[PDB]
Amino acid sequence: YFQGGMEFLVKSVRPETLKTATLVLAVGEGRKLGASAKAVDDATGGAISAVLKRGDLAGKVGQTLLLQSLPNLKAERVLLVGAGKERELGDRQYRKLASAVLSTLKGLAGADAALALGDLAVKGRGAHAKARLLVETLADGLYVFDRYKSQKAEPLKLKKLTLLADKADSAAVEQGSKEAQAIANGMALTRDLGNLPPNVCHPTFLGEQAKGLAKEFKSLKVEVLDEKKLRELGMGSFLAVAQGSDQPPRLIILQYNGAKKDQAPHVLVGKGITFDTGGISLKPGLGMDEMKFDMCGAASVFGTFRAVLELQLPINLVGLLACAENMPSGGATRPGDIVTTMSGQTVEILNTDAEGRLVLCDALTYAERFKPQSVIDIATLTGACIVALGSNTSGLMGNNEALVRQLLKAGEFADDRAWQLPLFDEYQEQLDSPFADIANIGGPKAGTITAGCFLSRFAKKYHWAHLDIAGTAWISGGKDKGATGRPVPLLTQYLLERAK
Amino acid sequence: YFQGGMEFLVKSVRPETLKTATLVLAVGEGRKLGASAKAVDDATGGAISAVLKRGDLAGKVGQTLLLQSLPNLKAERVLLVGAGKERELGDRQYRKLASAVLSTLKGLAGADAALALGDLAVKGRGAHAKARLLVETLADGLYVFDRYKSQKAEPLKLKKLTLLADKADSAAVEQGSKEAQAIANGMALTRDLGNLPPNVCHPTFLGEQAKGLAKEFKSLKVEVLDEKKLRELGMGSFLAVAQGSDQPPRLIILQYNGAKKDQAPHVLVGKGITFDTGGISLKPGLGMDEMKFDMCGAASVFGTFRAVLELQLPINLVGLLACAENMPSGGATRPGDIVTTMSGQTVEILNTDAEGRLVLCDALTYAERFKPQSVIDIATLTGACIVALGSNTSGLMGNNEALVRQLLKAGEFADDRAWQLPLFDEYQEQLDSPFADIANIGGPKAGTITAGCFLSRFAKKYHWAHLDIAGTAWISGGKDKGATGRPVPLLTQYLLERAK
Ligand SMILES: [Cl-]
Ligand SMILES: [Cl-]
Ligand SMILES: [Cl-]
Ligand SMILES: [Cl-]
Ligand SMILES: [Cl-]
Ligand SMILES: [Cl-]
Ligand SMILES: [Cl-]
Ligand SMILES: [Cl-]
Ligand SMILES: [Cl-]
Ligand SMILES: [Cl-]
Ligand code: NA
Ligand code: NA
Ligand code: NA
Ligand code: NA
Ligand code: NA
Ligand code: NA
Ligand code: NA
Ligand code: NA
Ligand code: NA
Ligand code: NA
């Protein structure tokens, strides 16, 4: 169940007799009230119709009108929210409607609210799929990160949200709500870890977080490998990234065995660069505070595990979090260094700011021992991905078409979308080095793709895919600056489908 | 008395019978010789008039004509200096005249010179105020910094300067000269500390300098706090600046009790960043050698104390020098770090090159314990101040209008001027952070002001002002590159007035 201060219930009772602090109804733009709103209007003797006739609420998506006590209702307030003029909403409009409702309710002193929104239609979504989107939007919309504020906002009075559904849909709605709550809990852990400042959130801290998660979930086993063990394993490019920082690196291994021992596991590999200065290839100063989000890949592995552990899915899951801090220093890796990866391939490190792939490639080699049926790495890897796909769609590459399709489908269902980019063999020659087996960077052309090509050289032994979340893992500026928790919804949906 | 190799005397004798190696007289452009010059001309039987009639000296400000022995004079040489055609000189012209005189005298083998310049008028300045400007310009014009030159210039022969004044003005001239000499001595210490290279002038060195000043002045008490004590005090942003450098930080506390114990002290807070690389937010290489001047704020607190201690002013004075070195390293503060200042306010360090305010804010909190009647911080804080006000006028902000006015008036009298910039409440929102109580930088707009706004959040408990000397503390290039010693003249004049 959701942990962020909200209980979500599903009930099949009549809205017009439900006791609640706020009853929420949808109002169309220039079309008749839906069945639920009409039943409530009838119960009040036409009071809602009479208000709407006065014209303050045009009915555009997300517009609101709040009424107090109406005759013959047990609702203390009635919140009208506009649903536009279309027969069906798209996902974006449904989310906008839900967020407008939540924003209003947050500011009220009501301890609960009941959503009578079952008459809304959303393109391509039945009861379960609508509940997944609605509850995830509501629950994630409650997220707060204020532990470093001396002045904290007043706690919400709102503590309970009831979804009204016809009895024939209530089981699907309940299922969707339960899954959405687990996803939102995972997103909240991901966002917390992403938002923590890098002087607190370093690799050792992430190791202790993993141990704490195992304390909470007896089904989770955790092992944390330090720099001595990494050197024993021959993890040369991983160590090269870490060596310039005072902070020691960590390889965190999470294991959950929800299925029979004969089922091959799915492996999630997360880039956990807790801060990325670029190293000797130093980044510019402007906006470099957002490099604390360079561990959002690893954070999303935490969050996906958190959701899976709550749902107790019948799957075998492994998490590999490759965490290091990338700092300049008198002992840092230099451009031109050549290192031997755990696979034995030598890499010429042309640019020390292309370091995510250097911790990932050793983790991908490590993943071979699990004989996985799928391996997915998640990383804030290339600014080129933002040029290619922006901030709303993650880049996706892989060496197996069926797995890539499974991830695309999961992202569509989750409304946490990705988009495939090709790993054509012609791109690989961009990584040729006169000195070593591989150069760690290509040119300025096709940067997201050549990063995927680099990783692919370590993933040939299994079905593998790669999510570039450089654009989707956080919001850069404004009031809403901070980690997003993506791609936890995509990944959790992928695993939900693999668990059937 | 001035310590840089010059004795300054005031005498009321007739210039035309004074024994001296060089007698200095002013000559107007196209107006009759003044009273003193005319008396000397008469004594020579018209020899000076006869030379001037030949036309080599037009009389423009600072032009010179040097004569040898003239009939009936006891002066071995007579130096004529042009004073222009105006009835009164401005401060700039008076300084230019004085510097031209000094430049000539420096090149002569005369052991002394007598200045018969009492007939010069300077706008808004009586005898005391003219003597303040003249002697300070002369004494500071003798400054030399050559300890790293293997080949040193020949020592000056000039060792004594006599100011001739009418008996009715001689007491005021003597007072002005005494104060100007103390100010020039303080400026020389400030300039020395500013000009020292940063591999010599680090925080520990500045601590030893403070101890040495207490050895020289029994009225001064000094305490030097190291990093352990700073951590005990909770000085988190100060420590964050220092942590990347091998050089430990120092908080230097100077105390002078020249008044009764019931008089609240005045506190000077100086930024002593002995070198500023920018840290992880690294500066460009061009001109970064001038970042050794990033401790000129603290240096000016040294210099102001040096002048006050010589004058034995009846005031209670405290100096707080917050000194650290700002270096990149594997343990340096990272953009995005959040730290807790000694006040308890949390700060998100968006840019590690805005570090002066991070050592200053903890020092401003520390200053509360003295129950001060005024607190002035001095810092080379923002390049934006140079854009706003250039290299000749310091920026001034504060939370108390009377104190700001007192400092402006002192700067006008000293001809070491400042100019107020507003700390309107509307600017404060530029420092909002989604994560912490304060961000350490605003945007690119109003950078000098938002830095002052940041400091103001730590100064609410007392009357406070802030001098941005990024433009006035040093000269960037050319033959005269080096520290200026400003704002020691402004600060010392402020304290002279507070001592009445
Ligand atoms: Cl159904
Ligand atoms: Cl750990
Ligand atoms: Cl360790
Ligand atoms: Cl976009
Ligand atoms: Cl799916
Ligand atoms: Cl007088
Ligand atoms: Cl010291
Ligand atoms: Cl020390
Ligand atoms: Cl200027
Ligand atoms: Cl004054
Ligand atoms: Na619509
Ligand atoms: Na839509
Ligand atoms: Na990087
Ligand atoms: Na990175
Ligand atoms: Na290229
Ligand atoms: Na003139
Ligand atoms: Na002038
Ligand atoms: Na700086
Ligand atoms: Na500085
Ligand atoms: Na700005």
Author numbering:
A (entry chain A), B (entry chain A): 17 to 516
Reproduce the article's own wording on this structure.
The apo enzyme occupied the metal binding sites, with likely Na+ ions present in the purification buffer. PaPepA did not copurify with Zn2+ if metal was absent from the purification buffer, according to crystal structures and fluorescence data. RMSD between apo and bestatin-bound PaPepA is 0.21 Å, and the RMSD between the apo structure and Mn2+ bound PaPepA is 0.21 Å.
Intracellular leucine aminopeptidases (PepA) are metalloproteases from the family M17. These enzymes catalyze peptide bond cleavage, removing N-terminal residues from peptide and protein substrates, with consequences for protein homeostasis and quality control. Here, we dissected the catalytic and chemical mechanisms of PaPepA: a leucine aminopeptidase from Pseudomonas aeruginosa. Solved structures reveal the presence of a PaPepA hexamer, which displays high similarity with E. coli, bovine lens, and P. putida PepA hexamers (RMSD between 0.4 and 0.5 in comparison to PaPepA).
